[PDB]
Amino acid sequence: RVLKVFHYFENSSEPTTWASIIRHGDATDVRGIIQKIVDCHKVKNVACYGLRLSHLQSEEVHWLHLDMGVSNVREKFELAHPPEEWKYELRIRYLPKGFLNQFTEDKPTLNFFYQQVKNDYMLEIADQVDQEIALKLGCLEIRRSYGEMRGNALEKKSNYEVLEKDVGLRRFFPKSLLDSVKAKTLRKLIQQTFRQFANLNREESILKFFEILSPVYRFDKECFKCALGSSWIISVELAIGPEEGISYLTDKGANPTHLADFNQVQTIQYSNSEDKDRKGMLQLKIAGAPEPLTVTAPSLTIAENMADLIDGYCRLVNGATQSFIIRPTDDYAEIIDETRDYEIQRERIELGRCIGEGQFGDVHQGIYMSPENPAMAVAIKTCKNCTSDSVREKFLQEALTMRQFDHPHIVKLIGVITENPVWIIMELCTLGELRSFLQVRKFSLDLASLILYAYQLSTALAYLESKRFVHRDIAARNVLVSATDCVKLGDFGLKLPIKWMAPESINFRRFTSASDVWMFGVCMWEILMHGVKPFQGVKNNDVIGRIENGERLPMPPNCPPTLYSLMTKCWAYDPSRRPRFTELKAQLSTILEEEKLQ
């Protein structure tokens, strides 16, 4: 059987669903699980990660000791409540002494840690933190998250808006702040506190983040109210952490008193309050001290959680692998990840000459003989590492989307072959890629033709808008020519094409219809420029630089100055001032009719 573990390693997905799915074995212990997830992310500080299980509708928490066997941990807890309501989440619990410093030379771990701490901050105290503090914090998460954007970006109404109204400032700030200040002024406050963190890369952001939190949120330890002693039980707060070891403080803030270091800890033992109540009993034998250090915790659970803490630490301080808690092949651990009419038998396909390359698989020419009906020329997108299953599942995911579309300027899906290697069968656009097509025919195509193509493209992009489908890569490279008077739209699958991208795409990784329109502008230029690439001989940074300053692509010779202004309307920095697709359709329609009559 399997297991889902939520963790804090980044993904362009939503943070609340970052997880790994492990096909564990029957004697597999929590070590196995942790090991295989962190090896899977190139983690150097393995000894610092633990596993914490908690029910959804409950606020209490269960630390799963390394040596426990998963299936009989399922067994135990899944006998209380269903697997649907339990949350297994990987956490850092065991800080080395220089921890922050040390995690700098372990990039995944610092990132994991930062996220895990940032999550808690939002969830636990963000609402009731100082106004200046919240502000300062939020900005660094902008700064860190959106690496490739230049500093002065947030002093642009459109940019800020994209954060306000598309991204959600809630991703950076508590509902408490956003509510209690007028939004137009909030815009200032951010632009302002953002100045101080203008030129800070991802690494420094994270540390400046921590630096500003630490004074107002201890994440460098855990505390437990509990009682010390074996007979005259006396009430204390325990602090357990890297620069203090086990410490009692009481009180108030003041100096914490040292009790032992983790390297002193001989053995751990815990048990149910054999006495009247329900309390946790915890015993620690220490260096040469003949009497065990005896802790009474409010519940057996807390006791267990405290043992996990102390074990983890010991097992870390000593370069140790086995436990310090005295007790009363199949451990395989694989990493995995989570219908059709239109089936075609492979024997009904003659696989012709390879026609285009794939970073994923080649595209081929082909004959398709369908029993009822004559032969048909088809394109065939092939798969190379097709046996590796999710790569397969993502490949023929593309075919699923193409099922949905039916429009005369989108390349029609014809079928799939759902056995390795997976094949996607589509129509073949005989006259090839548009760029090539244009260069070749630079002197035999009337203008009415060139803009006809943009018109047809726009009808397609309109159709796609109408189904809320963003394409992400509109360019003449993704257009094919199916006949003299007819072009079609290309890829629909999953080294950035900087020069065609809208600014918010280069800045905030945002991809909307409105980003699509910008690219379509550049596409339109390419067409009118008979298949030349935008910005020949300019490297990408000067381009983002020029785009940022106001420079645009010049009017191609022969472009009706109306159409050229439409292109620049598509190149509106603020994505909301850009035309709609349904609108560029209507316009080009007329701009064509006018061109037809000459």
Ligand X SMILES: CN[C@@H]1C[C@H]2O[C@@](C)([C@@H]1OC)n1c3ccccc3c3c4c(c5c6c(n2c5c31)CCCC6)C(=O)NC4
486 lies in the site for ligand X, by CB under 6 A: no
User: Catalytic site residue 473?
Assistant: yes
- Least CB distance from residue 433 to ligand X, whole Å? 5
The answer, yes or no, to whether the previous bond of 488 is cis (omega within 30 of 0) is no
Quick note: the x/- pattern for ligand X over 487-526, rule CB under 6 A, is ---xx-----------------------------------
- Residue by residue, DSSP assigns 145-161 as HSTTS-GGGGGSHHHHH
Residues 184 and 164: their CA atoms lie apart, in Å, by 11
Residue 431 or residue 555: which is nearer to ligand X going by CB?
Answer: 431
Of 29, 473, 491, 516, catalytic = 473
Decide: residue 560, CB within 10 A, 0-12 exposed, 13-18 middle, 19+ buried: middle
Q: What character string, x for contact with ligand X (CB under 6 A) and - otherwise, covers 320-359?
A: -----------------------------------xx-x-
Write down the least CB distance from residue 411 to ligand X, Å: 5
For residue 127, cis peptide bond before it (omega within 30 degrees of 0): no
Among 31, 279, 364, 381, binds ligand X (CB under 6 A): 381
* Closest approach of ligand X to the CB of residue 343, in Å: 19
480: contact with ligand X by CB under 6 A: yes
Residues that bind ligand X (rule: CB under 6 A) add up to a total of 18
- Residue number, 311 or 473, with CB nearest to ligand X: 473
Task: Judge whether 127 and 343 are in contact, CB under 8 Å.
Answer: no
- Binding residue for ligand X, selected from 205, 478, 505, 512, defined by CB under 6 A: 478
Q: Based on CB atoms, which residue is closest to ligand X, 189 or 363?
A: 363
At residue 411, the 3 state secondary structure works out as coil
Nearest residue to ligand X, by Cβ distance, number only: 356
Please tell me whether 587 is known to bind a ligand: no
- DSSP annotation of 167 reads I
Burial class (CB in 10 A: 0-12, 13-18, 19+), 363: middle
Give yes or no for a contact between 421 and 351, defined as CB atoms under 8 angstroms apart: no
Q: Does 408 bind ligand X (CB under 6 A)?
A: no
Residue 10 or 427 having the CB closest to ligand X: 427
Q: Which of residues 411-440 bind ligand X (CB under 6 A)?
A: 411, 426-429, 432-433
Question: SS3 for 24?
Answer: coil
> Minimum Å distance from CB 534 to ligand X?
16
CA distance linking residue 174 with residue 179, whole number of Å: 9
- Measure the CA–CA gap between 70 and 55, rounded to whole angstroms: 16
Strand, helix or coil for residue 26: coil
Scan for tokens 């490297």, then name that residue: 539
Amino acid occupying residue 253: G
CB of 502 to ligand X, least distance (A): 21
**Residues that bind ligand X in the complex, under the rule CB under 6 A:** 355-356, 358, 363, 379, 381, 411, 426-429, 432-433, 477-478, 480, 490-491
Please report, in range form, the residues annotated as the binding site for ATP: 355-361, 381, 427-429
Q: Which residues are catalytic?
A: 473
